Amino acid sequence: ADETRSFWITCQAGGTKYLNTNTSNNATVQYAGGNGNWSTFYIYKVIIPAPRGAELNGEGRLALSAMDNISFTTDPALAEEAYVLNITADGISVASSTEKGKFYALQSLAQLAEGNAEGLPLVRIADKPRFGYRGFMLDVSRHFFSVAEVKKMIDIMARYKMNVFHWHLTDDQGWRAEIKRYPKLTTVGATRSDNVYWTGNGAKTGKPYGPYFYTQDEMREVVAYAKERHIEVLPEVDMPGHFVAAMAAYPEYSCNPSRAPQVWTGGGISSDVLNVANPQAVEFAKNILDELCDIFPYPYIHVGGDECPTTQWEHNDLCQQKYKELGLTSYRQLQAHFIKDLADFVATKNKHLVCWNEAITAGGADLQTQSTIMSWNPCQEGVAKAVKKLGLPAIVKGDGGYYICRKQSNDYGEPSGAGYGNDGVEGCYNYVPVQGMYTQEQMALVKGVQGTFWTEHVGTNEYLEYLALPRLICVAEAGWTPQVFKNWDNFRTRLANQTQWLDDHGYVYARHWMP
């Protein structure tokens, strides 16, 4: 019973045993020079040693398919992320077109062995993802996690076979992505005068806070890591709105520079935008969207467009001198005409765009099609009609169910947090992002699901996992498992038995399910 239920599966009679007292050998089949054969196997074999001791190397002739037990053939008519894992008491044929394909094939397999290793039955496991957008996303804007950890959230992304990591480098409360034509944004941005966050009543804890941020070559480590677990990474930077961080520390552009701005210690909404009506406030942006590109080789940048009042535009007579230029009378639509510019100007050296889906809110006919919404408030109805039906791709961070960063149970010693019990685990794979979705184009413009985390009240390792886990999985199963074979009754079960992991490798995890 492997995980993120396989598309299609079979059983067969009486079981193999790896044999590693001597071995259970390799047989990767070259082509696609190295790439994903031996190579992304070499980090296999090593899988790990500490369980059993792999012991594969070659002792004999790894590379003859004739007494070869675990053969790594290529049949390049296989789709990319798709694998075909035969398990017999002779060995383990694993086919795959693209290393991505083949990476997963030994994931399932692993978990087919004992929950540790040595002792599988027989099976055939054709399996492939509904969505290649099975997403996460980490609010590292209100907070830094250390990388020991950041890594330890890609760790899981892996188990349950998601690929992208999306990254919240910047919101008001701090900025956490080093731009070197603008060190300040990180030296002052990234710093703040408090651990915590208000939110009307809650106070701050007037105690300084930092590790500031992530120097460029603390990215290029990260943005590397993933690739061997094929986790591509949307850089995001809430633009221009959620920018107190990057305004207090470069206000001259702003919409009142004379006015004493500073990093934020509470939460919720800021209005404090990047005066997007002054052709240097722009450059500022445009020169950021340079820096990213380089460090992030993934062909999207996530730009936000979310919940940004126009407050300081209305009364800014640059950003109402432009609003005659542009040629229209909806003043959301700098957010059109600021984002416009991001596209065609990052379409002359190469990269695309994503956004939150409030940015619909204008005549979202000003930008481009060719732009890839990521909605949450009215979920289904959000990536529906002026996104799919006007040919804009789209994701669906179901606010409901899939913000796996809301209190997961109303119990009376669950820590603080927002919620109302209304997000538990009977509630978060049940949440159906295929609620009568006509396929016309609306499932070749839907790209998939993504299980964000929002930090305000939540800021240490323990408790984020305690919240995160298990729900992460649910967003990741649905993500992968196709909506024909999707009922829980036997989800619970299989996924009690993935806590013995969360244990071994020192993951905190809820339990609610678990006896």
Among residues 204, 215, 222, 128, the alpha carbon closest in space to that of 166 is found at 222
307 carries an active-site annotation: yes
Asked whether 491 and 471 are in contact (CB, 8 A), the reply is no
DSSP 444-513: SS--EEE--B--TT--SHHHHHHHHTTTHHHHHHHHHS-TTS--STTHHHHTTTTHHHHHHTT-----TT
Three-class SS state of 281: helix
Cα dist from 324 to 129, 255, 290, 331, whole Å: 47, 18, 29, 10
Choosing from 55, 80, 232, 307, the catalytic residue is 307
Three-class SS state of 138: strand
Identify the helix (H) or strand (E) that includes residue 286: helix 279-295
Q: Indicate the length of the chain as a whole number.
A: 515
DSSP 301-336: -EEE--S---HHHHT-SSTTTHHHHTT-S-TTTTTT
User: Residue 372's Cα: distance from chain center in Å?
Assistant: 15
Show the DSSP H helices in 212-257 as ranges.
216-225
- First vs last Cα of the chain: how many Å apart? 20
Edge to edge, the sheet with strand 94-96 lists 10-12, 122-127, 83-87, 94-96
Three-class SS state of 234: strand
SS3 string, 56-121, reads CCCCCCCCCCCCCCCCECCCCCCCCCCEEEEEECCECCEEECCHHHHHHHHHHHHHHCCCCCCCCC
User: Residue 468's Cα: distance from chain center in Å?
Assistant: 13
Round to whole Å and give the CA distance between 95 and 265.
52
Asked whether 406 and 417 are in contact (CB, 8 A), the reply is yes
The CA-based diameter of the chain, rounded to the nearest angstrom, is: 78
- Crossing angle (nearest 10°) for helices 337-345 and 279-295: 40
Round to whole Å and give the CA distance between 433 and 192.
38
Q: Is 271 left (phi over 0), alpha (psi -120 to 50) or beta?
A: alpha
Round to whole Å and give the CA distance between 465 and 441.
37
Q: Catalytic amino acids?
A: 307
